[model samples]
Target: NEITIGITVTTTGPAAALGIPERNALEFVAKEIGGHPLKVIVLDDGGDPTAATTNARRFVTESKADVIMGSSVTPPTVAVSNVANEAQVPHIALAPLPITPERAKWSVAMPQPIPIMGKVLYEHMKKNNIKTVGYIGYSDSYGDLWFNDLKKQGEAMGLKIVAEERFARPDTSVAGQVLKLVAANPDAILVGASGTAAALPQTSLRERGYKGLIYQTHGAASMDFIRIAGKSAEGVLMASGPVMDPEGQDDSALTKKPGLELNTAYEAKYGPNSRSQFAAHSFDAFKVLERVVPVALKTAKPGTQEFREAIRKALVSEKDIAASQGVYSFTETDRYGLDDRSRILLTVKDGKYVMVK
Candidate 1:
């Protein structure tokens, strides 16, 4: 445990604004490692799938890291996942989408993926008296996985899929997809989108006079959507992992401060111009791994059978699961760290996502 834990990072390329704070949270995890100094080996993926894969492989082979992480793009994450699965090493991922069944066996993800997404949203639809629905996605692995999973779950709950569409990643123009879904007359519209793609369907839905509800995946739950889409983002409900709902007085502290007093402290370290509340999601991901690494080392050698079991054991028993960055917890389901079910719900008030309980 004293050596080094590899952190496959993608902070400062396409999504650096979001990735930085989350990475900062992990960098802070060392303060709480129970007498063990956590060594973090950092590598940047440059937001490229191939780069992620290549760097991840380097972490495993050259760095001799026991556990390696992946992300930024599905291909790199998938690439690292395959290497971990074959080598029988543990791989931790912090993507915003669901994991394929194949990947789930060998890796653990920070935000629980589609199965929970489907269950939560479907339950909402079943009770809401809604019938028809539509979806807008990014047309990539992240979007496609959720699109199909949500569709399956909705059908099981009798929530019909009226329309489904796709858009490119970070695409600024998505009105066409939004228009199609609105034309379907669905009672609710689900989206498998992230970044700016989330805004298009949401704005277009309201502008087109579609009075039905709009449910977004964690991707759409962001406060950034509101800044980008402005008045158009009102009335959008999203399914999300818990947000710290920071009680920092809602001022420049969160958007302008480049770094706050942190050590499980999540203030606007990246400054007040903007802050992604979900950044705490990654922060917690870092803490969880940091907490478990030592116990794992204590129980056995890094690569031994007993070592991984030790890691899993410390993980399952993580009681102080909350970070100043978020309101959170871990559960036995091995699903999203926050498996409260209640944590996953429709959150927004009078047209905006608010802290619901």
Candidate 2:
């Protein structure tokens, strides 16, 4: 018997930087699970929600996949999650999306929750004596999640959000948004976009002479942000997973070894410092499966409804499963299972990402 996994990701379009690495990492996943040959089917959604939905439907109806994963960013990930929930197949989301009650039954997030990442940013802001902040991000759900957290949690931490601005993912320029943000002139600015697009605001803010502190969400964890933003990216802070700087992690941390393993494997093939946080998320999905698949296989064979349900049950019941990114302990009600250990504060220094002590 063989087990099939269907993955949809944005290998093209604007978010291609994030999706390409994720697609590449899949090549290293286990060839078999529980003695059953593994069959992986990959599709490129091109960062389109419609394409992502179509891909998910094909996985369920045509491939009869035992499980589904991906569509690397928030909008498409949400689209895939809807299809997985409807088809009752377990979905391991590579992006952080809202895990509603219904979606939680069949979906688990591979990335840390926004709040977990936000807490790290807020803590850094407090320690650095940042009192007022400006917000600029994508005009999408990803941006909303970060803004909401800033309003509720950041405000609670005695930080005031003095300005807010947004731009679309494919937009070439955020000059208009930057103009307003600089005018407001908060103590610091937080750019809430991801992928290469996240660099637009940072570069524009610097060019516009707004030289206060700048922060980025975990979505901008990739090196591409630094490449695109160039000299402007220096001194910018970000919330990131341990996978970004695995060697810096304590030797005893559960995520460090696997994080190094993934980085070594990926950088060897893709070139030095080529590791991507998005790629680590994709690798971690299999890391999670390695722990749960054995338990599911004991009950039902692959390519059956029973097997699908079994996998879902195992995902929720599994606890403290460590991977390259974090230690996950999924529950029925919470799909994003990472805790404090999953997060780290990072800052760009001397043209590289260095851990913030």
Candidate 3:
């Protein structure tokens, strides 16, 4: 009788803060998408690829979900994508992970693609005459993906990566890594990690008396990053989606309405300043479904193979679907379907993110 949207997130341990909001946001969207009933099955991947894959299979085989989304971070998101491709289910990713050509045939992403957001950082560095740069990021796929794009775009802008550094997510210290970056004495530092852990290198640099421009990835677009980094977060720059500053956004803009509406609704449900880009990814996935689900329902019934296939086909053909994250225009070749309009340059000031040019 109702279409099922399977939601998976890593709502445990260090990643819990990120995934919890995504899950909660999906819960909100599940209740709001009216006229047709939506059955949302929420699962936890615990930031593990195996768990994510397992959950994806269950959502497809057991839950009979038409569309599947999630598992917060990139690795698990990628892992689950394999399942979606095999199952022929419409998969919408919450992270900005690279979409395989094969997966793009059946999957799309909520977060703006890496190249789109990556270029923003390189341009920022070039604007202020930053030449050499140092990098410290997670020793995993997430870090590798951003570093790859940063190197690609940074070199194009004549911004060399003087030193490359990596660390684990659960590590307590990055003092040694920071020491090397300090020794390199680059023009700026790019902390490629996310959340509270992203603060480690920044705090270390400040303590070691290294004063330089610091750039963070969109991964740190959460209040937890600010609270964890404290004063060390000040002056840090990052490219973020527009939800960071929903106020004063042009209401006529496709992105502004859904963004501000979600911001208002989320804050009302949770508390002031409780909304984040991470959570909005889930809401954006719902928007993708809102457009495609009815079309899928027209031809096939929910909990059937025809419905899953229908959703997958309809999703890739989606055009100009306004979401809390951005205005998506999914096509056969492009999955994320976002552009410069999806992002904003932001700086941390007085323990909060302030939108910059």
Candidate 4:
């Protein structure tokens, strides 16, 4: 009853489509945590790292929150984690980012880490006899993380990366990147950027008349991406969390129920087909906090230094906590608790995500 949660979301800029649904889900979850009144302070960072840090500082110092969550994309989430680590508040990222040793002590993320997703992607590629691939993504940590993981995981699986390209989030065109990728003529191309901006490479690739199989990261699973990419998005493949493949996972009764529940709840409120992959990330963030809060409470009362540390410890120890995404089981070395089980191969057909076998 004494806990307060601080959240930062980039509701403006290129990632607004990703952040708005995330913010909506967080507000939904904040109304209840362990059936107690959860005071949440939400801030918009406008997709800026500096603004993210400022919001996190205000949350820790002025708001005295027991835990902090979100800031929808990797850079802002990374920026907030720095402040959360310094303040010793337990931080949960709704976005996928690498958890450094400095931040891992106090920070954990909800989205399946890029390495896990990359492994899933490469396995699917190998199964389909796709040997070489090209990459295009943002020129930031998000892109770096996916590229590094895809290169490492894909190479190990005997899949070669033929070309790599980069673009800024606000770039009007990725024609240069697409031209290079088309020239490489790899078996497939993967775009690593998130939100609506992710559509740029796909659009350019289609316009350039490249007929190779196109792949997108889980970051591109939202309907916003479909709307932006239009017919260009058709047949694009991805490895994503259950939210995108909600209908045919054959997952556990417990796992399937929550994912369906999250999808149903969001759709019921926002209209059919309004649910997104990132919305489930916010729900999973609250679910993680729910699992840890009682354990933390057993150790110390909320709003204290002891309670914050207790929450951090409880988070790392969480196991088999079911939510809208994967059935999380965190360990000291693994913060996301995700594996291939957290992903499924899906393709975009008729502007919707459809499970591919």
**Per-candidate RMSD vs. true structure?**
5.4, 0.8, 1.4, 1.5
Ranking by TM-score: 2, 3, 4, 1
User: What are the per-residue Cα lDDT tens digits for candidate 3 across 1-357?
Assistant: 677888889899888777988987865675523366787888999988999999999998888888888878888999888899888888888886777787887788888777777788888889899999998998888899888887897788898889999999889989898889999999999888877788788788899988899999888898888888889899999878888777857777787878887888888999877878798888888877778887777888777889888877777666788887778888888887888788888899888788886
The residue-by-residue lDDT of candidate 4 on 266-311, one tens digit each, is 8888987787888988888888887889888787887789989888
lDDT per residue for candidate 1 within 1-357, as digits (tens), equals 444456665676545544555566664455435454555676777667777777777766776666666564455567777666665566776664354565555566665566665677777777879889888887888888877787676787887788888887767667777778778888988877765557777776787787888777765555567766677666666665434333332443321122233422444444542335446555556656666676666767764546655665666666645443332344445534544432345465544556533
Ranking by lDDT: 2, 4, 3, 1
Candidate with best TM-score: 2
TM-score versus the correct structure, for each prediction? 0.78, 0.99, 0.96, 0.96
Judge candidate 4 at residue 104 and give its lDDT.
79
Error of 4 at 71 (Å): 1.5
Go through the candidates in order and give each one's C-alpha lDDT: 0.61, 0.91, 0.83, 0.84
Best-matching candidate per lDDT: 2
Looking at candidate 4, the ten consecutive residues that score lowest on lDDT are: 27-36
Pairing residues by index, what is the TM-score of model 3?
0.96
Residue by residue across 31-104, what tens digits does model 2's lDDT show? 99989998999999999999999999999989999999997899999999999999999999999998887688
